[PDB]
Amino acid sequence: TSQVRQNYHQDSEAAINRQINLELYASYVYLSMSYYFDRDDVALKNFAKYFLHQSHEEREHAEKLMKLQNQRGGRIFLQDIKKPDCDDWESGLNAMECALHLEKNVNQSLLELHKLATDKNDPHLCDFIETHYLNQQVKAIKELGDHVTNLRKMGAPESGLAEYLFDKHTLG
Amino acid sequence: TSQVRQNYHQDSEAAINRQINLELYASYVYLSMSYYFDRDDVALKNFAKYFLHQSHEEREHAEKLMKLQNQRGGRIFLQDIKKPDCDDWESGLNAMECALHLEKNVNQSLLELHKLATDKNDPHLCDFIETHYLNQQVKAIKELGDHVTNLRKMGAPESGLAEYLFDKHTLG
Amino acid sequence: TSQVRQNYHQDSEAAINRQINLELYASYVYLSMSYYFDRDDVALKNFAKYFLHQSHEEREHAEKLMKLQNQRGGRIFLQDIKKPDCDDWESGLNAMECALHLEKNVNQSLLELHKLATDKNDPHLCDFIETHYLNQQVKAIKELGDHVTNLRKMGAPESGLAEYLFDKHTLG
Amino acid sequence: TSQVRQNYHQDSEAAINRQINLELYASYVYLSMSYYFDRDDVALKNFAKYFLHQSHEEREHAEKLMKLQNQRGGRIFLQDIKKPDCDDWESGLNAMECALHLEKNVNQSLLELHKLATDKNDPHLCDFIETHYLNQQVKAIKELGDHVTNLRKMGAPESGLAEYLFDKHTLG
Ligand SMILES: [Mg+2]
Ligand SMILES: [Mg+2]
Ligand SMILES: [Mg+2]
Ligand SMILES: [Mg+2]
Ligand SMILES: [Mg+2]
Ligand SMILES: [Mg+2]
Ligand SMILES: [Mg+2]
Ligand SMILES: [Mg+2]
Ligand SMILES: [Mg+2]
Ligand SMILES: [Mg+2]
Ligand SMILES: [Mg+2]
Ligand SMILES: [Mg+2]
Ligand SMILES: [Mg+2]
Ligand SMILES: [Mg+2]
Ligand SMILES: [Mg+2]
Ligand SMILES: [Mg+2]
Ligand SMILES: [Mg+2]
Ligand SMILES: [Mg+2]
Ligand SMILES: [Mg+2]
Ligand SMILES: [Mg+2]
Ligand SMILES: [Mg+2]
Ligand SMILES: [Mg+2]
Ligand SMILES: [Mg+2]
Ligand SMILES: [Mg+2]
Ligand SMILES: [Mg+2]
Ligand SMILES: [Mg+2]
Ligand SMILES: [Mg+2]
Ligand SMILES: [Mg+2]
Ligand SMILES: [Mg+2]
Ligand SMILES: [Mg+2]
Ligand SMILES: [Mg+2]
Ligand SMILES: [Mg+2]
Ligand SMILES: [Mg+2]
Ligand SMILES: [Mg+2]
Ligand SMILES: [Mg+2]
């Protein structure tokens, strides 16, 4: 057993490894979305920039969990990073809707992780999740909701003009 | 009687208390409007910013009247601040129309206050109203009229695109 | 149901609306206290400044809760802001005692809100309350306690000199 | 008749000359008060500074009225500047009370002047009085009221300590 380990349940250790994989998966989804908008037949450069930034943020989220695993004396166990659900994302609106779904799924995982940490009476882990993950998720979900609403109200996905102008005004 | 009181009719004192309440009410209306546009299903951040600024301005208007009451030796009497007429404001255009109606109502109250001050031969109070309130109201009403006109001409409220673009170009 | 809503109980939503009203009420109490000390027959300008600052802080507290409501996909429901308990606050000491009572009441409401959030297993809401409200309340209560103690020890409310000197040294 | 004179009643011209004398008288009262506090047996240097500043302000008030008289094509008529009512002012509190009485008397004169200007349909003169005199008077009266209140509450005039500390904290 690690010389640093204290009050860190094996179930929590395992759950943190699962969360690391999920964050990496989220980074991969956003990477794929980014380059969809870089296609010559889609060509929305600010959608591409927005999603690439999100992808880099998720990689940071994964790294912080790997750091946490080591800080607590757990051992990192990595799994394959699954390819994203979709190859073709259809429209800016559709990609934003996929992102919203993804972030709500990640949030659910984090809430399940918090429930476990609470059940195992691990207040350090609870605080870690609360401080570095929960409000970040709420902000991300709210922002994606805002984006979806604006695209819908503007006439997306039918209106190519709507997605073009959203690209310039909101994401530019 | 206050050692500072001079040429300040009890009717004017009472009217100033009523105006304080009205200014606070106006601040509350604009606060409510602001956060309507912050909803994930409305999501017009510059409408939200615009109305929040207006709300803060009305609170300043109320404070200046409270200061005036004390300067003249009257006594402040506060009443409940009523909740705004509407919870749901429908659209950017509708909120602007509500604001226009509100500011015209506040203007009418100020004109009635000025008539009273004139009738009681209180030139200090007349000058106070004229200097700090009347042109501010005329400018606010004109600006809201301008906003309503632009939103209508652009195709609001039916056009979600119109409200989106107005949010960026006029309020951004 | 809001596209952003996740793990946010209707009871929590309602409690947040109640808290918004309470914060606005607290802003109103402090506004009234501020202008009491601005009266020509009270004339303690630093008491007035202190309470006006507190009033503005409470308005910020209310706005942050309105922001939270929208972030979580709840819907803001506003109620009348009740006028403060007292019109005449008697002395600096009495106003400080009223403020202490108010802040302890607001704290109790926040603790009840936290209990609800805990019961509904909402760790994001728990963290929000803990981060933005609980220590702020403890600091405010401690500061008001300190102020009350000093005024008492100095000879308030009988000693007009005590309140005058406290105004200059502690609040100035 | 002056080549510049227009809509300027002879009664208004005369009233402006009377006001010039009153402003000069007020400057003289404050000059006398100032040097009372400079006496070795009174020795409150900030009371002395405060009243000397007030004296200089009144001289400016008189000059602006002399300027107005010429701007409108009236002719300045000067009278003796009467010595102040009191030679000995007793205490800081008593001097502040005398100043309050003086400023209320000057205010009454200005209100009478405004009534005359209104009766003679002279909106330029009304605006001049409103802009340069009326709120200045209200502020002065309020400030003197505040000062009187503080000195009383502190224990003046019996307490030499009260007047000493007021000199340092409020006027210093
Ligand atoms: Mg895994
Ligand atoms: Mg993100
Ligand atoms: Mg993440
Ligand atoms: Mg192991
Ligand atoms: Mg596969
Ligand atoms: Mg914590
Ligand atoms: Mg935080
Ligand atoms: Mg937004
Ligand atoms: Mg542009
Ligand atoms: Mg009222
Ligand atoms: Mg405004
Ligand atoms: Mg207003
Ligand atoms: Mg009364
Ligand atoms: Mg009602
Ligand atoms: Mg005027
Ligand atoms: Mg003006
Ligand atoms: Mg315009
Ligand atoms: Mg454009
Ligand atoms: Mg309520
Ligand atoms: Mg505070
Ligand atoms: Mg608060
Ligand atoms: Mg509902
Ligand atoms: Mg009631
Ligand atoms: Mg926390
Ligand atoms: Mg903290
Ligand atoms: Mg302390
Ligand atoms: Mg004369
Ligand atoms: Mg002066
Ligand atoms: Mg003068
Ligand atoms: Mg002549
Ligand atoms: Mg004589
Ligand atoms: Mg007029
Ligand atoms: Mg004018
Ligand atoms: Mg002015
Ligand atoms: Mg004052």
CATH at C83: 1.20.1260.10
**How many distinct structural domains can be found in chain B?**
1
Which of D99, D151, D157, D125 has the alpha carbon at shortest distance from D16? D125
The answer to whether D103 and D34 are in contact (CB under 8 A) is: no
Q: Can you tell me which residue has the tokens 């006496």?
A: D39
Q: What domain range is C104 assigned to?
A: 1-172
The answer on whether B58 is annotated among ligand-binding residues is: yes
Is A169 touching C (CB cutoff 8 A)?
no
User: For chain A, how are helix, strand and coil distributed in percent, rounded to 5?
Assistant: 75, 0, 25
Distances, alpha carbon A62 to alpha carbons A18, A69, A76, D93, D147, in Å:
10, 11, 11, 72, 65
Is B131 touching C (CB cutoff 8 A)?
no
Centre of ligand 33 from the C-alpha of residue D130, in Å: 6
Centre of ligand 24 from the C-alpha of residue C130, in Å: 6
For residue A155, what are its two tokens?
Answer: 């006439």
**CB within 5 A of ion ligand 33: which residues?**
D 127, 130
Is C123 touching D (CB cutoff 8 A)?
no
Closest residue in D to B72 (Cα–Cα) = D138
Is D106 touching B (CB cutoff 8 A)?
no
Which of A47, A84, A30 has the alpha carbon at shortest distance from A160? A47
For residue C157, what are its two tokens?
Answer: 């409310």
User: What span, in angstroms and rounded, lies between the C-alpha atoms of A74 and A59?
Assistant: 20
The answer to whether A75 and A66 are in contact (CB under 8 A) is: no
Method used to determine the 3D structure: X-ray
The answer to whether D137 and D103 are in contact (CB under 8 A) is: yes
B114 Cβ neighbours under 8 A, 6+ residues apart = B126, B129, B130, B134
Is A75 touching B (CB cutoff 8 A)?
no
C149 Cβ neighbours under 8 A, 6+ residues apart = none
Q: At CA A33, angle to CA A17 and CA A114, rounded to 5?
A: 30
The answer on whether D137 is annotated among ligand-binding residues is: yes
DSSP type of residue B81: B
The answer to whether A161 and B159 are in contact (CB under 8 A) is: no
Q: Which residues of chain A does C123 touch, with a Cβ-Cβ cutoff of 8 Å?
A: 111, 114, 118, 126, 129-130, 134
Closest residue in A to C8 (Cα–Cα) = A138
The answer to whether B113 and B16 are in contact (CB under 8 A) is: yes
CB atoms C6 and A145 under 8 Å: no
| Residue A41: Cβ within 10 Å count | 5
The answer on whether B137 is annotated among ligand-binding residues is: yes
The answer on whether A63 is annotated among ligand-binding residues is: no
Which of B16, B14, B11, B21 has the alpha carbon at shortest distance from B121? B11
Q: Can you tell me which residue has the tokens 């102040």?
A: D84
CB atoms D145 and C42 under 8 Å: no
User: What span, in angstroms and rounded, lies between the C-alpha atoms of D138 and D141?
Assistant: 5
Report the residue from A135, A139, A149 with minimal CB separation from C127: A135
In sign, the C-alpha dihedral spanning A28, A34, A40, A41 is: positive
Ramachandran angles phi, psi of B139, nearest 5°: -65, -40
